[PDB]
Amino acid sequence: SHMCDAFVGTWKLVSSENFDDYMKELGVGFATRKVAGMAKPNTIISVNGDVITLKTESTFKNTEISFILGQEFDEVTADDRKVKSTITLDGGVLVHVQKWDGKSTTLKRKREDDKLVLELVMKGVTCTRVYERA
Ligand SMILES: Cc1c(C2CCCC2)nc(N(C)C(C)C)c(-c2nnn[nH]2)c1-c1ccccc1
Numbered sequence: 001s002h003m004c005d006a007f008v009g010t011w012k013l014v015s016s017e018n019f020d021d022y023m024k025e026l027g028v029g030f031a032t033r034k035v036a037g038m039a040k041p042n043t044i045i046s047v048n049g050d051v052i053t054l055k056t057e058s059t060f061k062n063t064e065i066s067f068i069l070g071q072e073f074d075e076v077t078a079d080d081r082k083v084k085s086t087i088t089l090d091g092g093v094l095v096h097v098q099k100w101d102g103k104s105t106t107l108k109r110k111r112e113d114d115k116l117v118l119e120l121v122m123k124g125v126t127c128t129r130v131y132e133r134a
């Protein structure tokens with residue numbers, strides 16, 4: 001048993017607040033924002049030993065990251081940013097920091113009731129996206 005077991009499973013988007021705003025703060029273009037904002041992504045989270053995999057499937061884009069907690073990795077995001085990423089587990093919350101071009105954004109995932117709640121922060125903007133088991 002792993003702490004990340006709380007996160008393992010297939011998760012579907014059920015609500016979103018301020019995602020367009022968050023995407024604007026990152027400099028995401030209009031067409032990507034419109035189509036991605038519309039989409040209904042699922043996330044499959046799996047653990048295999050020390051390696052955690054987060055795989056996104058949608059009609060917009062499919063993406064995958066695999067990582068070990070605390071070990072920096074190069075990530076190319078869905079909006080084509082080339083970032084240095086580090087993901088850690090802090091007091092039960094998966095905390096993902098991305099660094100690029102002297103900027104930073106933090107993505108936090110936490111379990112709340114039967115939900116997986118994603119809090120995205122860029123500069124002053126917080127977006128909350130809520131996911132439930134598929
Ligand atoms: C385009 C996109 C983005 C980019 C815009 C902001 C930075 C990258 N970030 C996402 N999440 C929430 C994280 C990684 C920030 C998601 C996403 N939403 N749920 N899972 N992934 C999506 C998304 C993918 C496919 C279908 C719809 C939306």
Ligand SMILES: [Cl-]
Binds near residue numbers: 109116118131
């Ligand atoms: Cl997620």
